[PDB]
From a paper:
Functional and structural characterisation reveals that members of the CirpA family directly bind to properdin, inhibiting its ability to promote complement activation, and leading to potent inhibition of the complement response in a species specific manner. Whilst many molecules act to control inappropriate activation, Properdin is the only known positive regulator of the human complement system. All CirpA structures share a lipocalin fold with a short N-terminal α-helix followed by an eight-stranded beta-barrel and a longer C-terminal α-helix.
Using this strategy, we were able to purify CirpA1, A3, A4, and A5 and determine their structure using X-ray crystallography to a resolution of 2.0, 2.1, 1.8, and 1.9 Å respectively. Overall, the structures appear very similar, with the biggest conformational differences in the tilt angle of the C-terminal helix H2 as well as variations in loops between beta strands 4 and 5 (L4-5) and between strands 7 and 8 (L7-8). We identified three regions with high conformational variability between homologs. All these regions are part of the observed binding interface between CirpA1 and properdin, and hence the conformational differences might render other homologs incompatible with binding human properdin. Another CirpA1 residue undergoing a conformational rearrangement upon properdin binding is Y122 which forms a hydrophobic pocket around properdin P377 together with CirpA1 residues F122, Y131, and F150. However, it is likely that the homologues have evolved to target properdin from other species, especially given the identification of multiple CirpA homologues in a single tick species.
Numbering used by the authors: 48 to 59, 59a, 60 to 152, 156 to 172, 174 to 191, 191a, 191b, 192 to 203
The structure:
């Protein structure tokens, strides 16, 4: 029912982008928490340019994306050079290893990301996570493309 973005990011492991519908994604997209209060998270969002890793420090302010004011399902983002303004966790597995995130950027841009806590096989992921994402991907594939920024050999 309820997907807590603050708890999804409450981890010391890397959270990888396993799939995205962003048009021009960099490789090896991942987030790494630096520190966290109840209402705020500082984390490092990195990607790769062939061989070099590029780190961006992100200031994130949790907020209530839905009408439910008891749950932090949204985060306002500063520091993301894709000009991401906000993110919305619309599903996470019970163990919070898998999550689906709507990403909102610039004025009118939006895409979806399948985010995974730690390196693991795609087949091992929460089935609902996988099938919801795959259903969406199949339904929009005529105009929007899903790709995987993740490689095993990402740093
Ligand atoms: Cl895009």
């Amino acid at each position: 029912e309820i997907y807590r973005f603050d708890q999804f990011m409450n981890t010391d492991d890397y959270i990888w982008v396993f799939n995205t519908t962003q048009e021009g994604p960099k490789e090896c997209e991942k987030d790494k928490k630096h520190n966290m209060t109840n209402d705020k998270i500082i984390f490092v969002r990195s990607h790769q340019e062939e061989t070099k890793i590029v780190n961006e420090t992100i200031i994130g302010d949790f907020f209530h994306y839905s009408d439910n004011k008891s749950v932090y399902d949204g985060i306002y983002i500063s520091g993301d050079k894709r000009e991401v303004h906000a993110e919305h966790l619309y599903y996470s597995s019970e163990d919070m290893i898998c999550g689906l995130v709507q990403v909102f950027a610039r004025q009118t841009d939006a895409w979806t990301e399948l985010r995974v806590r730690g390196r693991r096989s795609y087949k091992s992921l929460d089935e609902v996570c996988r099938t919801q994402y795959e259903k969406y991907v199949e339904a929009i594939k005529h105009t929007k493309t899903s790709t995987s920024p993740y490689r095993d050999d990402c740093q």
